[PDB]
């Protein structure tokens, strides 16, 4: 009933270690950060920290200011270095820089954030290669707690969560509904699904009206309100009422960094097998 | 009441002509058929003919027998020729031949069928460039007959229909449910949406029990029964009940070949400017 993530991250990180030591890989991950955004920084350092434990060399390159032309050149150079298995740009970026523009210059087999068109399309086609970390984290919760072949309603249609997630849930036989700010009756869809995945960035959005007693809630929202991080679900309204709910922090959060590192291992292992 | 695609294809065909004149393109499409399949030849010849009417040069190459590794060569050969704007391989292929893996070797900006990873990924990212013909035809009829921003239930999860179509509908603000053979209660989902799209390839699948009077049925199924062709829906049974319904043949069918041609036009415009 409390869907925690850290124990799932620990298991994933153990077998990643195992997979590295086993097949001799020495995966390398480059992280590019522009600006000094504080969420990005914690996320970067978490990937360095778990990387150092798993056996993954993770390096951050911070730039106070960098031009498009320079940044594209840097990425192109990392792209060509066979010593670099994964490349990732941290978010958010400053205005004028389109993430999706930059990211398609990273070979799909190095694209560990897995948001480029090629990885997204491989998911659509049901031939997952690299898959993005939050959607992955959603399914990890479901795999590890025992939810299969259910109706799922996703509240979110962005390319980072909602869309790749619906394609990953279809690959695994779930029945899927996506709704969003243009759905006129969200409550109706969320109450009729076994699972609700919520990501609207809106504290208290998912309350008792939006779910039934059978429901399982996976809260992918991250809101910073009066000095604390909080999800999109009303945890205290819901915990006495739903079947299961991921807390925030402590739900899908702890898994994300490890899922990026999981893509780095897959990237490095495809490069070894295929060049 | 009755949602016909012929008028839509002619209006689209004229636009294609307008767009071809106004930029002096000579769009050029290659088609490849392996085998003697009846529906594939019908489809190929439709694109040739509608092509002529329109200003697009479409040329078909048949092969009684081709070696996988010469095919890859001729495809790479059509790729490097800047005089070919569009490449399409006709379905079905022989046993053992993987369509998706041949198609990866067409550059995405020539991939008029639009089922390769890169093009699927662009749909997901709401950056539509070339889109597959059937899902475009669905969105053509919805548009032409005035069904905008609705709830839609898709019964189908294949990369050729349900998957791109779910992403294209979400790009246009529809609320979207995808269900399939592992869904427990299909009718419960089909009844709760204003629009129902079916492509399960089972005659009389969709009947009164699975829709309501408010419903709009778009029938993408193509089945053979008594030699004739029939959809997935019970046309006789639904049309004094449902609000509007596509006939089969005559619904989405008539627009398909022209949607491939629209892709070739778009392919040519893109190439003109990018190279």
Kindly give the residue spans of alpha helices, DSSP state H, lying in A81-197. Answer: 99-103, 117-124, 133-145, 162-171, 186-192
CA A236 to the chain's CA centroid = 25
Cβ-Cβ contacts under 8 Å for B49 (sequence gap 6 or more):
none
Q: Which residues of A touch B (CB under 8 A)?
A: 100, 115-127, 149, 151, 157, 159, 163-164, 166-167, 170, 173, 175-180, 182-183, 188-189, 192
- Contact between A159 and B120 using a beta-carbon 8 Å cutoff: no
Tokens 């597959």, located at residue: B132
Say if CB B247 and CB B259 are below 8 A apart: no
CB burial class (10 A; 0-12, 13-18, 19+) of residue A251? buried
Give the Cα separation of A6 and A255 in Å (integer): 7
Cβ-Cβ contacts under 8 Å for B96 (sequence gap 6 or more):
none
Give the Cα separation of A178 and A172 in Å (integer): 16
Q: What is the DSSP letter of A43?
A: H
Chain A contact set for B192 (CB, 8 A): 188, 192
Give the Cα separation of A218 and A174 in Å (integer): 15
Q: Give A154→chain B minimum CA distance, Å.
A: 10
CB burial class (10 A; 0-12, 13-18, 19+) of residue A24? exposed
Tell me the β-bridge partners of A155.
A179, A198
Interface test with A, best of B109, B124, B166 (most A CBs within 10 A): B124
Tokens 């097949």, located at residue: A23
Cis bond leading into A249, ω under 30°? yes
Cβ-Cβ contacts under 8 Å for B220 (sequence gap 6 or more):
B134, B138, B156, B161, B197, B198, B199, B231, B232, B252
Kindly give the residue spans of alpha helices, DSSP state H, lying in B26-147. Answer: 38-54, 68-80, 99-103, 117-124, 133-144
Q: Roughly what angle, to the nearest 10 degrees, separates helices B256-274 and B38-54? A: 60
The DSSP element (H or E) to which A73 belongs, if any, is helix A68-80
Cβ-Cβ contacts under 8 Å for A32 (sequence gap 6 or more):
A61, A63, A71, A74, A75, A87, A88, A89, A90
The experimental technique behind this entry is: X-ray
Say if CB A53 and CB A261 are below 8 A apart: no
CA A75 to the chain's CA centroid = 22
Give the Cα separation of A44 and A58 in Å (integer): 9
Structure tokens at A124: 């659509």
Measured at the CA of B109, the angle between CA B252 and CA B41, to 5 degrees, comes to 45
- Rg (C-alpha) for chain A, rounded Å, is 19
Give the Cα separation of B164 and A68 in Å (integer): 32
Cβ-Cβ contacts under 8 Å for A12 (sequence gap 6 or more):
A140, A255, A258, A259, A262
Q: What is the DSSP letter of A36?
A: -
Q: What is the DSSP letter of A110?
A: G
Cα separations (Å) of B146 from B55, B142, B199, B243? 30, 6, 22, 13
- Contact between A117 and B122 using a beta-carbon 8 Å cutoff: yes
In a 3-state reduction of DSSP, which class is residue A104? coil
Measured at the CA of A248, the angle between CA A19 and CA A201, to 5 degrees, comes to 110
CA A183 to the chain's CA centroid = 24
Q: What is the DSSP letter of A20?
A: H
Which of B121, B122, B175 is nearest residue A183 as measured by Cβ atoms? B175
DSSP A156-186: ---TTTHHHHHHHHHHTT-EEEEE-TT-S-H
How long is chain B? 275
Cis bond leading into B231, ω under 30°? no
Tell me the β-bridge partners of B249.
none
In a 3-state reduction of DSSP, which class is residue B245? strand
Tell me the domains of chain B and their CATH numbers. 1-3+132-253 (3.40.50.720), 24-107 (3.40.50.10860)
Tokens 């523009």, located at residue: A101
Give the Cα separation of B5 and A57 in Å (integer): 57
Q: What is the DSSP letter of A94?
A: P
Give the Cα separation of B156 and A170 in Å (integer): 10
Q: Which residues of B touch A (CB under 8 A)?
A: 100, 115-127, 149, 151, 157, 159, 163-164, 166-167, 170, 173, 175-180, 182-184, 188-189, 192
Which of A127, A163, A180 is nearest residue B124 as measured by Cβ atoms? A163
In a 3-state reduction of DSSP, which class is residue B223? strand
Cβ-Cβ contacts under 8 Å for A106 (sequence gap 6 or more):
A75, A78, A79, A87, A116
- Contact between B125 and A124 using a beta-carbon 8 Å cutoff: no
Chain A contact set for B155 (CB, 8 A): none
CA of B175: which chain A residue's CA is closest? A179
- Contact between A100 and B177 using a beta-carbon 8 Å cutoff: no
- Contact between B120 and A125 using a beta-carbon 8 Å cutoff: yes
Give the Cα separation of A175 and B183 in Å (integer): 6
Q: Dihedrals φ, ψ of A129, to 5°? A: -110, -90
Structure tokens at B91: 């379905």
The DSSP element (H or E) to which B190 belongs, if any, is helix B186-190
Give the Cα separation of B105 and B76 in Å (integer): 7
Interface test with B, best of A105, A125, A158, A160 (most B CBs within 10 A): A125
Give the Cα separation of A30 and A20 in Å (integer): 18
DSSP A219-231: E---EEETTEEE-
Give the Cα separation of B237 and A220 in Å (integer): 44
Please count the residue pairs, one from chain A and one from chain B, whose beta carbons lie less than 8 angstroms apart.
105
Cα separations (Å) of B19 from B127, B153, B262? 21, 34, 10
Structure tokens at A221: 């929202």
Cis bond leading into B92, ω under 30°? yes
Cβ-Cβ contacts under 8 Å for B162 (sequence gap 6 or more):
B154, B155, B156, B178, B180, B197, B199
Interface test with A, best of B175, B185, B189 (most A CBs within 10 A): B175
The DSSP element (H or E) to which B165 belongs, if any, is helix B162-171
Say if CB A173 and CB A153 are below 8 A apart: no
Q: Give B72→chain A minimum CA distance, Å.
A: 19
Say if CB A115 and CB A103 are below 8 A apart: yes
Say if CB A88 and CB A113 are below 8 A apart: yes
Measured at the CA of A115, the angle between CA B82 and CA B102, to 5 degrees, comes to 40
Say if CB B263 and CB B131 are below 8 A apart: yes
Chain B contact set for A125 (CB, 8 A): 100, 115, 117, 120, 159, 163
Task: Say whether A158 counts as a known binding-site residue.
Answer: yes
Give the Cα separation of B39 and B46 in Å (integer): 11
């Amino acid at each position: 009933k409390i869907l925690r993530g850290e124990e799932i991250a620990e298991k994933k990180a153990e077998n990643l270690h195992g997979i590295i030591e086993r097949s001799g890989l020495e995966p390398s991950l480059k992280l590019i950060q522009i600006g000094d955004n504080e969420a990005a920084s914690i996320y970067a350092r978490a990937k360095i920290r778990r990387g150092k434990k798993i056996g993954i060399a993770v390096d951050l390159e911070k730039y106070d200011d960098i031009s498009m032309k320079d940044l594209l050149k840097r990425i192109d150079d990392l792209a060509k270095d066979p010593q670099i298995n994964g490349i990732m740009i941290e978010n958010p970026l400053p205005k004028g820089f389109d993430y999706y523009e930059i990211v398609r210059n990273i070979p799909y087999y190095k694209d560990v954030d897995a948001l480029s068109p090629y990885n997204q399309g491989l998911i659509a086609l049901n031939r997952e290669f690299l898959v993005p970390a939050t959607p992955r984290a959603v399914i990890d919760i479901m795999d590890y707690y025992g939810y299969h072949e259910n109706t799922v309603t996703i509240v979110n249609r962005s390319p980072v969560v909602g869309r790749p997630l619906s394609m990953m849930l279809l690959n695994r036989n779930y029945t899927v509904s996506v709704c969003h700010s243009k759905t006129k009756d969200i409550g109706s869809m969320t109450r009729s699904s076994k699972i609700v995945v919520v990501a609207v960035g809106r504290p208290g959005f998912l309350n008792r009206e939006m779910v039934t007693p059978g429901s399982v809630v996976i809260d992918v929202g991250i809101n910073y309100v009066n000095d604390k991080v909080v999800g999109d679900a009303n945890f205290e309204d819901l915990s006495e009422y739903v079947e299961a709910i991921t807390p925030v922090p402590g739900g899908v959060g702890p898994i994300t960094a490890t899922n990026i590192l999981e893509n780095v291992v897959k990237a490095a292992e495809f490069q070894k097998n295929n060049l």
